[PDB]
Amino acid sequence: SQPKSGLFVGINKGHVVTKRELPPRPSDRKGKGTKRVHFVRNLIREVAGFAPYEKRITELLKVGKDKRALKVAKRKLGTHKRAKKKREEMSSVLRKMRS
């Protein structure tokens, strides 16, 4: 949303072309829980339960070992970014169960 300073070197370093706002595209909504897919996923979760590695994460979070939970999720899922997301879901399941 910012035009460049026309200098060929520096922070912006480019030709000035009076930029415009890009319109929304359908693919902007990818990976977005809409409805009725969360419902189906949530219903299957209570029918199926939790994987044993997910339970091991949950018991680690109950005793406050949040760093040990991240290392177990990293071992299982293989990626730090996925481990962070999986721990957050595990914490929310405890948070929802808290009420």
Binding site: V40, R41, I44, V47, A48, G49, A51, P52
Partner: protein
Amino acid sequence: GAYKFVSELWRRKQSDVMRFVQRVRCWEYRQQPAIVRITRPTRPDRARRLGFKAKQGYVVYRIRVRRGGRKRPVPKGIVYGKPKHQGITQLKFQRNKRSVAEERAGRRLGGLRVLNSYWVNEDSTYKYFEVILVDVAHSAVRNDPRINWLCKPVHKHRELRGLTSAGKKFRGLRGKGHRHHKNRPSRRATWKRNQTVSLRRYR
């Protein structure tokens, strides 16, 4: 629409429900031949996305293939060559197990044509796939404009030329741009293009 519920359940393979149901099925497949015709897909929702329809002309087979790597089949583990080529045991087949299963089915059923296959089970020594095949001589297939293409002669034995979904996986066609440009049109076509000595008439 119940297909989403079925699909979501099959994503939880480690639940008590799926583990029990898969364990009983895995036992029963072990008492059957390695190539068995079934009257109905076990995973109908997974079959819909891969092209299966509940019509006369679509048939489903369960194929059992052995797990593990590819030992070099030389008479005593003896190689006559340089030590770079002396390995025997820890080598790997270049095609996946899914393509091996549908290639066995194609050889057994020459009158049919493989659509694709999906994973079904495994224990330790066997992997199970269900392969969808089409009877391209049936009028229901010949009159359906969405499956008519399979009746044309250029699609004969596509499982043997690496043209199914499993074949595109091991051919390196499940990615684009750099990291995959050497696989198009094929790796051998790419290699031949780079070996050419172009001797123009005005050089």
